[PDB]
Structure formats: structure tokens, C-alpha cells
Scaffold this active site. Structure first.
Site, PDB file in Angstrom:
ATOM      1  N   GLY A 148       0.797  -1.221   0.000  1.00 31.86           N
ATOM      2  CA  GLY A 148       0.000   0.000   0.000  1.00 31.86           C
ATOM      3  C   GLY A 148       0.823   1.260   0.000  1.00 31.86           C
ATOM      4  N   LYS A 179      -0.299   2.461  -4.311  1.00 30.05           N
ATOM      5  CA  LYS A 179      -0.637   3.846  -4.615  1.00 30.05           C
ATOM      6  C   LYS A 179      -0.282   4.211  -6.053  1.00 30.05           C
ATOM      7  CE  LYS A 179      -2.235   6.007  -0.731  1.00 30.05           C
ATOM      8  NZ  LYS A 179      -2.530   4.870   0.216  1.00 30.05           N
ATOM      9  N   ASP A 259      -5.658   9.973   2.431  1.00 25.11           N
ATOM     10  CA  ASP A 259      -4.736  10.803   1.658  1.00 25.11           C
ATOM     11  C   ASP A 259      -5.477  11.657   0.636  1.00 25.11           C
ATOM     12  OD1 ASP A 259      -1.435   9.168   1.311  1.00 25.11           O
ATOM     13  OD2 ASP A 259      -2.676   9.421   3.091  1.00 25.11           O
ATOM     14  N   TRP A 355      -3.514  -1.105  10.099  1.00 27.29           N
ATOM     15  CA  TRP A 355      -2.601  -0.868   9.001  1.00 27.29           C
ATOM     16  C   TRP A 355      -1.288  -0.372   9.630  1.00 27.29           C
ATOM     17  CZ3 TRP A 355      -3.760   0.307   3.402  1.00 27.29           C
ATOM     18  CH2 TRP A 355      -2.629   0.825   2.729  1.00 27.29           C
ATOM     19  N   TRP A 356      -0.281  -1.237   9.744  1.00 26.76           N
ATOM     20  CA  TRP A 356       0.972  -0.820  10.393  1.00 26.76           C
ATOM     21  C   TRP A 356       2.002  -0.325   9.390  1.00 26.76           C
ATOM     22  CZ3 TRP A 356       1.992   1.146  14.797  1.00 26.76           C
ATOM     23  CH2 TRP A 356       3.280   1.106  15.400  1.00 26.76           C
ATOM     24  N   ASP A 362       8.672   4.706   2.180  1.00 26.81           N
ATOM     25  CA  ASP A 362       8.373   5.558   1.036  1.00 26.81           C
ATOM     26  C   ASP A 362       8.506   7.044   1.357  1.00 26.81           C
ATOM     27  OD1 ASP A 362       5.933   5.820   2.547  1.00 26.81           O
ATOM     28  OD2 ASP A 362       4.690   5.040   0.905  1.00 26.81           O
ATOM     29  N   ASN A 390       2.400  -2.488   6.151  1.00 29.50           N
ATOM     30  CA  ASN A 390       2.763  -1.889   4.896  1.00 29.50           C
ATOM     31  C   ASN A 390       4.285  -2.027   4.770  1.00 29.50           C
ATOM     32  OD1 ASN A 390       2.408  -0.459   2.541  1.00 29.50           O
ATOM     33  ND2 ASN A 390       2.364   1.579   3.515  1.00 29.50           N
TER      34      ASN A 390
HETATM   35  C1  LIG Z   1      -3.857   3.790   4.345  1.00 29.27           C
HETATM   36  C2  LIG Z   1      -3.288   4.907   5.216  1.00 29.27           C
HETATM   37  C3  LIG Z   1      -3.267   4.434   6.646  1.00 29.27           C
HETATM   38  C4  LIG Z   1      -1.881   5.272   4.748  1.00 29.27           C
HETATM   39  O1  LIG Z   1      -0.887   4.971   5.427  1.00 29.27           O
HETATM   40  N1  LIG Z   1      -1.833   5.914   3.561  1.00 29.27           N
HETATM   41  C5  LIG Z   1      -0.575   6.369   2.908  1.00 29.27           C
HETATM   42  C6  LIG Z   1       0.108   7.390   3.854  1.00 29.27           C
HETATM   43  N2  LIG Z   1      -0.285   8.597   4.253  1.00 29.27           N
HETATM   44  C7  LIG Z   1       0.639   9.105   5.065  1.00 29.27           C
HETATM   45  C8  LIG Z   1       0.585  10.469   5.778  1.00 29.27           C
HETATM   46  C9  LIG Z   1       0.130  11.626   4.901  1.00 29.27           C
HETATM   47  C10 LIG Z   1       1.080  11.888   3.730  1.00 29.27           C
HETATM   48  C11 LIG Z   1       2.065  12.880   3.856  1.00 29.27           C
HETATM   49  C12 LIG Z   1       2.916  13.114   2.767  1.00 29.27           C
HETATM   50  C13 LIG Z   1       2.774  12.378   1.570  1.00 29.27           C
HETATM   51  C14 LIG Z   1       1.790  11.384   1.446  1.00 29.27           C
HETATM   52  C15 LIG Z   1       0.944  11.144   2.533  1.00 29.27           C
HETATM   53  C16 LIG Z   1       1.621   8.205   5.216  1.00 29.27           C
HETATM   54  N3  LIG Z   1       1.347   7.132   4.480  1.00 29.27           N
HETATM   55  C17 LIG Z   1       2.081   5.857   4.266  1.00 29.27           C
HETATM   56  C18 LIG Z   1       3.573   5.984   4.640  1.00 29.27           C
HETATM   57  O2  LIG Z   1       4.209   7.033   3.839  1.00 29.27           O
HETATM   58  C19 LIG Z   1       1.853   5.456   2.830  1.00 29.27           C
HETATM   59  O3  LIG Z   1       2.584   4.279   2.562  1.00 29.27           O
HETATM   60  C20 LIG Z   1       0.348   5.174   2.597  1.00 29.27           C
HETATM   61  O4  LIG Z   1       0.193   4.841   1.256  1.00 29.27           O
END
Ligand SMILES: CC(C)C(=O)N[C@H]1c2[nH]c(CCc3ccccc3)c[n+]2[C@H](CO)[C@@H](O)[C@@H]1O
Ligand SMILES: CC(C)C(=O)N[C@H]1c2[nH]c(CCc3ccccc3)c[n+]2[C@H](CO)[C@@H](O)[C@@H]1O
Ligand SMILES: [Cl-]
Ligand SMILES: [Cl-]
Ligand SMILES: [Cl-]
Lengths: 585, 585
Positions: A148, A179, A259, A355-356, A362, A390
């Protein structure tokens, strides 16, 4: 006299009852007609791989292996088990008894039988097996990985290898949600091209062969329309999209709202509810719907002990049968204490999914996340029924952490992060395990310096020896012995990394070569920093000035490189050494 | 019309009793011939400098200054004070009343009258004085500076200028102990050459004129001998050395045992006791002897509640009259809580002396320490009667922090570090104070990244703003207004520093030019960091890569430079921006 080999996950109940025995070059196989096909296939494969023939007719002098489920008609299964069964015993549970030439495997269901085979494969070394009585079943009923992350998605071959790896480690859940797959999120309405549908098929077949639930994830939240004819048109696109995968064998679905800018909580949940009604319930053989809301960590969901408006409306609208995932107190966070799971569980009054976001990297791609599950309450299963991590875009090196997740989610109560981490590297790395631990030990802590931090601290023992060095020097106490020791540690880091560069299989090496070069640079800067200290203590100005040049140049290489490792330890030591004025005289 | 100007130290009791008045071109002076000589001489200097003449002769219509001690019988004093008196105050106390064209200054003793004059000097602006009723006296009886650092010792001109500065701010103690004066430590037995002695005479004379106790330190510990004839020879060496300074008017002395390998507690204390007897008491007019034991910070002195071997023996051998100094919980530490002073004072069974290692920067010379006294308990006087700071080798900029030490130690209960710090800069820098505040705000926290840390955090309000920025960006919330506000802050950092470069007097500029240029470099990197963020928001890859190259360059410049400033704020912010991945999708 055997002994019991490393096992993963740790079995719930294991008793050693005898000296152990050698498995004959040819065995007798009973029950393979009624036993779980998948389980039997995995057995055949292992047996073939280990040069073990199956007898066509029964042979008294041969090792006998009996296999089946509890309600199968198999007399010999009852007999060789001698009392203990899987009756007993939740879904995925199984009994395994090895005693005096016989090996019996009984699952509560086919999953359990498959998993019993996995433990069998782990028990046998050199045809020798210990004599044991096992009863076993998972703490948590859904355990696995969500692909993810942002960045380059895993290749098709990566995923096929990952799926076998989940089966071998009793992980039963793989969520497809990259993503950066265009058809997952950016072009969620668009159907998969034929060639990519054929690949999904192979993935779905692979999952089934391994008792893994393939979860097809979709992320429409950027531009899905909710009202009127457009809402109709878009909702139909979700149905169409799920149907194409369903028709290939998919029985698990996730719709995700993370997001995104839009925080229309009622509309999100209403979509979930309609999909749940017209697809999940209507198909009848589909597992509960999985989701993540736009507020998905406690900081985002809660303000002063109470749900924020979005979370409040979403909780009160989403049907009770839908699995809601959350990431813990933060998106990437040190821990999930029990009180956090309790808070969120009460808000949704349902058992939660996790969801850990570890080992995912990334958000800080220069560092590899090579540590165990760390910070998750051992009592989490009270509030959590579904657990997924994740991982990194680096599929091979994610296996270290994933390996520990398998142990954490199957045997939660006895989970020991340090022991699990060691066992993971032992099992994955073979002859290279001791060296791989040296390197990986420096690359467990994730920290982007702001919002994202999680993982065991890097090399904590070495960090404690460094602190004591400074303690002694600032106290004007003799540090000769500690200094000699730290030379030993730095030389060992460099040698370990060099051995890894020369001997890691390419699949591993391709993912970590830069970080390896980085730790060597750091080790060299750490050594020179010791030279710098030793010169200052010897009042040798020229040896100072020469060691310090090296130290600074290595630190500068490490700082300017993409690869990142051991920030608070091997890297910070140089900075600390350069800031310690021992010229004060 | 007319407000009370910034005063330092904060008087114990001040009250505005009227609107204020203007002092005439010439005044009636009364009591000069009976009041303290040093107080009057300081008064005359002030009158001369502010173009105020003294009547010959007396009256009109002309403002009346009346000055003296309680022990004197001056009627005009008594009439002018109208009920207020210094009669019941401790040593160094005074009364000042300015009302209806009269100014009365009455000290408890000659020291108090002098301090009365110092307060008068701070009260007058352009001949205007507020009408006030003040009674005032120090919390702590010994308040000053120990020049006790490693590095280039202060010049003779430096010291004369410091001594006057101490007078003006009511500091009464100057300890002469520079580590790198050969004749203090390296060559402790050896007499000062003639020209050094003449400079010492000047220092001694200046101290007397400013009511400052000049304290002569000696550090014999590296190589002093204790046993037999060698020990006699060496003890006499101490006597010879002290006599030479006594013979010039020195009446306080220190013998220091810090930073040595010899932990001979009995021998050290025996040397102290022998000197106390054969010198201090034999002379009759020498103030109590001052010492530092080889263990001098709580960590070195104490092991769970109890004294360590050396401290136990020191404490119980050393004569009760001897003033013993300690640094707090550590050598360079955040705080001295009341509990620490209670513990140490308990062990020594007396009131302690503090040697406070701030603003000294000898252990981390790239950074200037420009913050207030911070972390020192406001009830410390219960266990401490003697308070000194170890300053920087940079005499001029040490004044900011010293200024605050003057307020803390004289008026402990009302000490407010932020206000004292602001007052220090207002009072010292005049027209440049606002710009100097911007810059100095970034240079309060000392931290060598290992054993030494102390001081107020750098730029705390900017740090919180930075924090709030990351909380909004990682929650994907609109941050445009804060982004904008921080552009303003970084621009203002660069502007202030540029003005400081163009307009600081050279004697201050020569101490901080490199740090000025560091903060400019970082402000520019901070600005580029915001640009880098804004580009990622706009999905503008070109602007991103370009701002990123700049922000990284500015950081690397700052990291490589000798000068250090704002590590956790301006510098860290760039590191934070560079690790915040906003290119994810
Ligand atoms: C499904 C959500 C719990 C989640 O973790 N969504 C995205 C997610 N959102 C976020 C925080 C908000 C964010 C800030 C900057 C760029 C993208 C997202 C972090 N993450 C994960 C770690 O980077 C990323 O892997 C994941 O795809
Ligand atoms: C008199 C003592 C309370 C004391 O602080 N002694 C010296 C002192 N000793 C120490 C700790 C021991 C040390 C460590 C590394 C290099 C030199 C000394 C620190 N300091 C001060 C700050 O650097 C230094 O200015 C001071 O002269
Ligand atoms: Cl821990
Ligand atoms: Cl290198
Ligand atoms: Cl001796």
C-alpha cells in the site's frame, strides 16, 4: 539430539517428548486422498525437494506420515495422534504429533492442515525430526501484508515469491493496494488491460494455493462523485471494477479513503454501505468489506478524548460488518498501546483492523527498515482482529520485518521482538546470518525528523558503549579498555558489510548495496574518530589533525550520499567526537 | 512623564510616589565629605559626563542631591528620606527617595551608598528622574564572575572594562583564575614578572573603586608535592605567591583542585587548612578562603544520596570557614534544583558557593552563549551564599549573560529570565537592541552533543511555529498563512544580521562576525526550504529541484563552518524540510 529447529510462527503449544528420529529415504503416506489438496501439494513439493520418495505400497520399515482434517474418515490419524487432536481448536488450528517413526498432521480445517505442513517443513533438518506434540492456532484471525506504499510497485515475480513466503509463515492476507498502480487510484474507473488481468489471475491462483486471502483494494476518493447521475455512474464503476476481479476468484475487497482532500464522511460510508449491500451481501461468498477512513490515526480521529466530526459521522454511518483499519496514535508512530486500541475500538464499537506503517520507507527512502515489530501491545488482540503491515518497495529485505509480523500476529502473547528479529535473520540468511545481523542492527529505526518515527533504536548496545566513552573522558577516567573495544566494534561493522557485499545473493544485494557502502564509510569515520581521541589524549597534534581530516571526510561522504543508516549511532558518534574538545589543557 | 527606566538589578522595593521632575543644570550637593569616597567619586564622574554642575554656594530653585550612610548624622538626609531608611537592611543595602526636587541616597554601609549611586545613574534620563521610594539589598551576599575558562585569557583592558561593568550592575566579586595563565597553574610556583604585577596593581585598584572583591586564584594540583621537605617547599611556594598579591592589596584568595588526576582528599584539605591558619587567620583582614574540590559536580561527588570516598574525606577534613564551590548536578548542566543544593550543602554542612559554567564556551567555541541565567532555582539562596559565573573568552558579549546573573543573584525571588534577557539587550545595545535580540535569540542553548549542555532553548517561538508547520503539512491541511509568516521570520533574521554587521561597534562585532554570517546563511536556507515545500505542493518539479539544491547547499555551508548557531531551530529546519517527502503522488 535433534534439536527443535527455529520455528516461525512460534507454535502455541509445543512439548518435546522423545529423543528424535531419522525419516526414511522413502515414506508411507496415509490420508492424502481426503486431506486438504493445497496442504498435500505443499507436502509433495517439500518431499520431492528433500529427495524423499513416496511408497506405492505400505512398508513396515518406513517412516509413515498421516495427514487429514478432524472430520475426515482416517483411522490411522486418530491412532498416531494418541490423545491430542485439533478438535478443540479454532479455525486455522492444527495438531502435529511426531513419535517413533510416525508423523501425524490434523487441521480443524484445510487451512490448519496446510499450516501443519508448514511446521513440518520447519521441523525436519537432514531427514531428522524431533519428537513433539503440537497444538497450534493463531492469536489474530487475519494476518498479512498490504502492498500500500507510494513508489515502484512490486513486480509480478516479487508478489508470487511474497505469496509463497506468506504461506510458509502462516500469513493469510495479502492486500493489493499500490498507490502508484494507475488502475488502483489515479484511474480507478478504468479497467485493467488484458495482460494485467492475466497476471492478477496468477496472483489469485497463487494466493489460493497458499491459503492467503487476496484482497482487491480500490482507492476512488480523489475524484469520485457522490450525487445524482454522476454518483450513479461512479458507483457503477466501482461495482464493474470489483466484478472483473470477482470473476477471476477474488472474494475480498477493500475501499480506501486515505490521503484525500474530501472529507465527506457520510458519503464515504454510504458508498461503503451500498457496495456492501449490492455486492458483498448479494454475492454471498464474499468476506467483510475493508476500509480506511480519511481520518485513520488517533491524532487525526480524536480531539480531547472525543471523535472529531468526520470520525464521528463515519463511525455512526458505516455498517457494523465493515472492517475499519487504523494506523495507531500516529500515521508512523512508535507504539500502539492497549489504551489507544481501546479508544478507537470503543469509537467504532467493533474490533479494529491495523494498518501498520512499518517497514514501509516511502517517506524516507534512503533508509532500509530492517527491524522487528516494535511498540505493538502484546494485548492488542482484545481490540484488534485483523493485522497487516505496509512493507518497503524493496520486497526481499521487507521479509525480515514481515517474518516478525508473522510471529507477532500468530503468537502475540509470547512475542519477543529481539528473539524474533534474531530468528528472522537466522532463518532467512543461513551462513550469512551473523554478518547480516551486524548490518541490519544499524538499520531498524525510522525517523524523518518530523511526523514519522517508529522502530527499535539502531544498535542500542553500541550506542550505550559510545555514551560510556564520553562519560569516562569527560570524567577524566582511563578509557583505554573501552577504546580498544570500540575499535573491535568498528572493525567488525566493516568486515561484516564487506562479507555481505562479496556473498549476499543478488536479490538481496541489489536492494542494499548503497547502505552497505554507507555503513562501511561510517565505520571508517568511527575508527578515525577514535584515532582523533587517542591523539588528543597523547597530545600528538599532527596525529590529531590527520585523524580528524579523515573523520570529517567520511562524515561528509555519509551526509552527501542518498543512503542513510545508523543516524543516532555510527553517524552521530563522528559528530560527537568532532565536538568533544580534548585539547583543553 | 515620567516612567522608571530599565533598571538592573531589579530593586527589592520600588514605588512610584509621583509624576517625576527634571534635575537642574547645577545642583546642591550635600554630604560628599562624609559619604563613602568611592560612591562620591562615581557620582562626580556621572555628573561630569551628563553636564551637571555642582553649586558653590547653594540654592535656588536648584535640585538637591543628599548622600550618606546611616552611621552618619546628616539632618537633610533624615528630612529628605521622610520615614524611609536603610537602618534595618543587610550589608550593601540602601535607600533612595526622589521627591519634589530632592534626591536622597542613604546606604547601610559604604557599599550600599555606592550601589545607591549606581541606581541613581540608571534612574536619570536627560536630567529627568521618576519620583520613587526604593529600599534595596542583595539576595546573595557574593555575586560575581570567575575568569576560570580555558583559552586566551581576557586582556588587561578587557578586565578593567569588566570591573567597571560589575560596579554598575552591583556585582561584587571578581575571581582571577584563567586556566591558561601559566603563573596560575602550569607554572604556579613562579612569581609574576614585574609588568604583570603592575597590571595586577591596576586590577586591584579598579576593583576597590568599584566595590568588587578581587579574588586571587591558584591551581597547584597537577604537580604539588605534599610529603616531607618537598611538601614544605611547595607549601611555602603557595605562601610566597599569595603574599606577593596580599602585599598589593588583595584580601580574598582561592585554591583550586579541579581537573587533576590526583584524588588525595586528605592532602588537598590539609593544604587548605594550613593556608587558612598560616595565612588567612594570621592576617586578620583576609576574607574566607575559597576552594573547588577535585569532585565538584553532584555526579562526581555523590553516589545514591551519599558522598563518594574523596568528597566524604574532603567534607570532613576541610575547615568550616572555607567556602567550597560546586557546579551543580553536572559540570555543564540544565539546572540546579533546590534539592541539589540541599544535598550538597548537607554534605558540607554549610552554605555553598556556585561556580556556574555558563556563558563559558571553551568546550564548544564555535557557538556564542548569549542567553540569560536559566535553570537555577529561585530559592537557591537557602543553601547558597556565593554565586559566580564562568564567562566566555569573548568579554564583550559575555555581558549579556552576566547582566542577567546580576539580577538573578541580587533579586532572586523576582528573577524572570525572559524579562532579564530583554532588559540586558535593551540596556547594553541601545539603538541596535531589537536587531541584536533577533540574532542573540538564536544563540542561547549550549550543547556539545555529549556531556555539556545548558541554557535556554534557541528561538523557542520560531521552533513552535516550525512544529505547527509540519503538523499541518503532514495532516494535508492548508498552511499558506503560516508559510507566509515564516517567510517573514527568515527575512527578518537576515535583515537584523545585516544591520548588526553594518552597525555593531567593532569590539562586539569582532566577537560575532562569523556567527552573524552563519545565521544569514541559515536564514537563506530556511527561505529556500519553504520554497522547496511550496514547489512540492504545486507539483512543480523544476522549482523543487532548484530550491532543494540551494537549501542543501546552505545547510552544508553552515555544517562545515567553524561558527555554530541555532542548531535545533534554523539549522534543523532545513534538515526537516529536506526529509519531508511531498512528492508522494
Ligand atoms: C492507508 C493509510 C493508513 C496510509 O498509510 N496511507 C498512505 C500514507 N499517508 C501518510 C501520511 C500523509 C502523507 C504525507 C505526505 C505524503 C503522502 C501522505 C503516510 N502514508 C504511508 C507511509 O508514507 C503510505 O505508505 C500510505 O500509502
Ligand atoms: C573549577 C571547576 C568547577 C571547572 O569547571 N573547571 C574547568 C572545567 N572542567 C571541566 C570538565 C573536565 C574537562 C573535560 C574535557 C576537557 C577539559 C576538562 C569543564 N570545565 C569548564 C568548562 O569547560 C572549564 O571552563 C573550567 O575551567
Ligand atoms: Cl524498548
Ligand atoms: Cl568513503
Ligand atoms: Cl607527595
Amino acid at each position: 539430539q535433534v534439536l527443535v529447529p527455529n520455528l516461525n510462527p512460534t507454535p502455541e503449544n509445543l512439548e518435546v517428548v522423545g529423543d528424535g528420529f531419522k525419516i526414511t529415504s522413502s515414506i508411507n503416506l496415509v490420508g492424502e486422498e481426503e486431506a486438504d489438496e493445497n496442504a498435500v501439494n505443499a507436502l509433495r513439493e517439500f518431499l520431492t525437494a528433500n529427495n524423499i520418495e513416496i511408497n506405492s505400497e505400505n512398508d513396515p520399515n518406513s517412516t509413515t506420515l498421516i495427514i487429514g482434517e478432524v472430520d475426515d474418515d482416517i483411522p490411522e490419524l486418530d491412532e498416531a495422534l494418541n490423545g491430542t487432536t485439533a478438535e478443540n481448536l479454532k479455525e486455522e488450528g492444527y495438531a502435529l504429533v511426531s513419535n517413533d517413526g510416525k508423523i501425524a498432521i490434523e487441521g480443524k480445517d484445510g487451512d490448519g492442515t496446510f499450516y501443519g505442513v508448514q511446521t513440518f517443513k520447519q521441523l525436519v533438518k537432514e531427514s531428522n525430526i524431533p519428537e513433539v506434540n503440537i497444538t497450534d492456532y493463531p492469536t489474530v484471525s487475519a494476518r498479512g501484508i498490504v502492498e500500500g506504499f507510494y513508489g515502484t510497485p512490486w513486480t509480478h515475480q516479487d508478489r508470487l515469491d511474497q505469496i509463497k513466503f506468506y504461506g510458509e509463515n502462516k500469513l493469510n492476507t495479502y492486500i493489493y493496494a499500490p498507490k502508484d498502480d494507475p488502475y488502483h487510484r489515479e484511474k480507478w474507473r478504468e479497467p485493467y488491460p488484458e495482460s494485467e488481468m492475466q497476471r492478477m489471475q496468477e496472483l489469485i491462483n497463487a494466493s489460493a494455493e497458499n491459503k492467503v486471502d487476496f484482497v482487491f483494494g480500490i482507492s476512488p476518493g480523489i475524484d469520485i462523485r457522490f450525487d445524482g447521475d454522476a454518483g450513479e455512474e461512479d458507483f457503477n464503476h466501482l461495482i464493474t471494477k470489483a466484478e472483473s476481479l470477482y470473476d477471476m476468484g477474488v472474494r475480498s475487497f477493500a475501499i480506501y479513503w486515505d490521503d484525500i482532500q474530501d472529507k465527506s464522511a457520510a458519503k464515504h460510508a454510504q458508498v461503503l454501505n451500498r457496495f456492501n449491500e449490492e455486492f458483498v451481501k448479494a454475492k454471498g461468498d464474499v468476506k467483510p468489506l475493508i476500509t480506511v477512513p480519511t481520518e485513520y490515526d488517533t491524532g487525526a480521529m480524536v480531539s480531547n478524548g472525543q471523535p472529531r466530526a468526520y470520525t464521528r459521522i463515519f463511525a455512526e454511518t458505516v455498517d457494523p460488518s465493515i472492517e475499519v483499519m487504523w494506523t495507531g496514535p500516529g500515521v508512523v508512530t512508535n507504539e500502539i498501546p492497549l489504551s489507544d486500541a481501546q479508544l478507537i475500538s470503543g469509537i467504532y464499537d467493533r474490533n479494529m483492523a491495523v494498518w501498520w506503517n512499518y517497514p514501509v520507507t516511502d517517506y524516507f527512502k534512503g533508509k532500509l527498515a530492517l527491524g522487528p515489530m516494535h511498540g505493538l501491545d502484546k494485548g492488542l488482540n482484545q481490540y484488534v482482529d485483523f493485522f497487516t503491515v505496509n512493507p518497503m518497495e524493496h520486497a526481499e529485505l521487507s521479509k525480515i520485518s514481515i517474518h516478525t509480523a508473522a510471529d507477532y500476529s500468530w503468537n502475540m502473547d509470547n512475542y519477543d521482538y529481539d528473539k524474533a528479529w534474531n530468528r528472522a535473520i537466522d532463518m532467512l540468511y543461513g551462513d550469512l546470518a551473523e554478518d547480516m545481523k551486524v548490518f541490519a542492527n544499524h538499520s531498524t529505526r525510522m525517523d524523518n525528523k518530523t511526523w514519522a518515527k517508529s522502530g527499535r533504536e539502531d544498535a542500542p548496545e553500541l550506542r550505550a558503549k559510545m555514551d560510556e566513552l564520553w562519560n569516562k573522558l569527560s570524567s577524566k577516567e582511563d578509557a583505554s579498555a573501552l577504546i580498544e573495544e570500540l575499535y573491535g566494534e568498528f572493525a567488525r561493522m566493516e568486515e561484516a558489510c564487506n562479507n555481505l557485499k562479496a556473498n549476499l545473493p543478488e536479490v538481496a544485494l541489489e536492494e542494499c548495496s548503497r547502505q552497505l557502502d554507507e555503513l562501511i564509510t561510517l565505520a571508517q569515520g568511527d575508527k578515525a574518530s577514535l584515532d582523533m581521541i587517542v591523539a588528543q589524549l597523547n597530545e600528538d597534534t599532527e596525529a590529531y589533525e590527520s585523524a580528524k581530516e579523515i573523520a570529517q571526510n567520511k562524515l561528509n561522504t555519509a551526509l552527501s550520499s542518498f543512503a542513510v543508516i545508523s543516524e543516532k549511532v555510527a553517524q552521530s558518534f563522528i559528530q560527537e567526537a568532532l565536538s568533544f574538545d580534548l585539547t583543553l589543557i
